[PDB]
Write a protein that binds this ligand. Sequence first.
Ligand SMILES: Nc1nc2c(ncn2[C@@H]2O[C@H](COP(=O)(O)OP(=O)(O)OP(O)(O)=S)[C@@H](O)[C@H]2O)c(=O)[nH]1
Ligand SMILES: [Mg+2]
Length: 278
Amino acid sequence: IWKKKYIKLIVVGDSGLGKTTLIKSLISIPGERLQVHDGSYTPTEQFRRDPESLSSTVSWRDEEDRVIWVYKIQDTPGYGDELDVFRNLKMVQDYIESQNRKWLELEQARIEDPRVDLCIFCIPPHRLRPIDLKYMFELGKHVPVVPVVTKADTMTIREANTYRTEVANRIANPMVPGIHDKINIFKFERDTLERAGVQDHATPHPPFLVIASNDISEELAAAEPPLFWPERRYPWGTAEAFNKEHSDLLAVRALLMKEALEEISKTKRARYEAWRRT
Ligand SMILES: Nc1nc2c(ncn2[C@@H]2O[C@H](COP(=O)(O)OP(=O)(O)OP(O)(O)=S)[C@@H](O)[C@H]2O)c(=O)[nH]1
Ligand SMILES: [Mg+2]
């Protein structure tokens, strides 16, 4: 009767960029559980000895299509947590490979799908470094990448417009030694981007610029009924994560959690098929 479909995202980036805060905002679709982060750092050892404790899950039903979506977002430690950046890269690459070997062993015997479909690559504000592009390239060889600039409240409007173009340009032309193929960026359809409320910039395929917060408005949480409004309250003013003029966060969630569900699931068999030559 019901058909179950599975999406698994993995989130990667440098340490302290707000990866875990962003994850908790993404899976906290209104109507669901409202999950929040406490600001502590994601330890490398925890990902090694208990990666499931770093996985967030949400599920919902599509009545008309008779589909049960099971959505997982895998958190990872920042690749600045240790001395060697490429140890983190290998750890994440091995995680993706391990999920494929799980699916193969289950398919051999025979269906809870553990495979990774998409990577959210969190980019620091103001400056994109060669190691970020190197990480993005090598990771893209295993899974398509969605670039997201976090902590967008770090940049003025003018800085943000300049950086959005620079990030898009560097991804198309990294100019990093050893990168000789294109970075595997996931291409969303325009109809999908428009339905999600993505603004149509002059720069093609820009990154998303998000603000996320584990703090909520005290005034709005005291409403009847309470309204949950993530905010970042500074002495000079308050940035709002759900404000379309401050943050792409709501557009990112609509894109990844709703509008792009089909085209992410479609490319699943092709990706795994290419992987099988191993
Ligand atoms: N200025 C600003 N700070 C943010 C934003 N999102 C999260 N932060 C802050 O960044 C700090 C770390 O956030 P966190 O989500 O834990 O980063 P992280 O990437 O997961 O850290 P890691 O150790 O696991 S690698 C917290 O103080 C949080 O409040 C944001 O959008 N703007
Ligand atoms: Mg974290």
